[PDB]
Swiss-Prot record:
Site (Histone H3R2me0 binding) residue list: 34, 37
Region (Histone H3R2me0 binding): 40-44, 60-62
Organism from which the protein derives: Mus musculus (Mouse)
Residues at the site labelled Histone H3K4me0 binding: 23
Protein name: E3 ubiquitin-protein ligase UHRF1
Gene: Uhrf1
Domain notes: The tudor-like regions specifically recognize and bind histone H3 unmethylated at 'Arg-2' (H3R2me0), while the PHD-type zinc finger specifically recognizes and binds histone H3 trimethylated at 'Lys-9' (H3K9me3). The tudor-like regions simultaneously recognizes H3K9me3 through a conserved aromatic cage in the first tudor-like subdomain and unmodified H3K4 (H3K4me0) within a groove between the tandem subdomains. The YDG domain (also named SRA domain) specifically recognizes and binds hemimethylated DNA at replication forks (DNA that is only methylated on the mother strand of replicating DNA). The YDG domain contains a binding pocket that accommodates the 5-methylcytosine that is flipped out of the duplex DNA. 2 specialized loops reach through the resulting gap in the DNA from both the major and the minor grooves to read the other 3 bases of the CpG duplex.
Modification comment: Ubiquitinated; which leads to proteasomal degradation. Autoubiquitinated; interaction with USP7 leads to deubiquitination and prevents degradation. Polyubiquitination may be stimulated by DNA damage.
Assembly behavior: Interacts with DNMT3A and DNMT3B. Interacts with DNMT1; the interaction is direct. Interacts with USP7; leading to its deubiquitination. Interacts with HDAC1, but not with HDAC2. Interacts with BLTP3A. Interacts with PML. Interacts with EHMT2. Binds hemimethylated CpG containing oligonucleotides. Interacts with PRAMEL7. Interacts with ZNF263; recruited to the SIX3 promoter along with other proteins involved in chromatin modification and transcriptional corepression where it contributes to transcriptional repression. Interacts with UHRF2. Interacts with FANCD2.
Tissue expression per record: Expressed in thymus, testis, spleen and lung. Within testis, expressed in almost all cells except elongated spermatids.
Gene ablation phenotype (knockout): Mice display a sensitization to DNA damage and replication block, and die in mid-gestation.
Chain ranges of zinc fingers (PHD-type): 6-73
Compartment(s) where it occurs, according to its Swiss-Prot or TrEMBL record: Nucleus
Induction info: Up-regulated in proliferating cells, and down-regulated in quiescent or differentiated cells. Early induced by E1A in postmitotic cells. Down-regulated by aphidicolin.
Function (record text): Multidomain protein that acts as a key epigenetic regulator by bridging DNA methylation and chromatin modification. Specifically recognizes and binds hemimethylated DNA at replication forks via its YDG domain and recruits DNMT1 methyltransferase to ensure faithful propagation of the DNA methylation patterns through DNA replication.
Residues of the full protein shown: 304 to 372 of 782
Length: 126
């Protein structure tokens, strides 16, 4: 059967007016509540509080959060005992048109340049 076409994003290229796994929820590939999704700290990808995890329905109080694969893949060894900040969320990013476009262009370029690195990987783009 035929494939979809339209104005294309640069990490999923499906449609800029539609939700994706990297534009919206990485776990359902959609958007419904843009005020109940978490962001990784390595990928900055969205994750519904009710798609990403079965137990809790609310965002943690801690200083950093990465996707459940990244958090299992030894990126940090332990939970934090000091509240330096709270984790990143769409209720913060998606609730601002600049934080939206910054996470969608600025972050997408951060990872997409690393996927085809022109120099050593410690290039400090952020
Ligand atoms: Zn996309
Ligand atoms: Zn979802
Ligand atoms: Zn991640």
């Amino acid at each position: 059967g035929p494939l979809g076409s339209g104005p294309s994003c640069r990490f999923c290229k499906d449609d800029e007016n539609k939700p994706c796994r990297k534009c919206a929820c990485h776990v359902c590939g959609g958007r419904e509540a843009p005020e109940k999704q978490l962001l990784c700290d390595e990928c900055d990808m969205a994750f519904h509080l009710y798609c990403l995890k079965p137990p809790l329905t609310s965002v943690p109080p801690e200083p950093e959060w990465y996707c459940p694969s990244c958090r299992t893949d030894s990126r940090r060894e332990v939970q934090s005992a000091f509240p330096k900040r709270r984790v990143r969320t769409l209720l913060s990013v998606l609730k601002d048109p600049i934080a939206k476009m910054r996470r969608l262009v600025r972050i997408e370029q951060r990872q997409k340049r690393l996927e085809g690195n022109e120099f050593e990987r410690d290039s400090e783009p952020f």
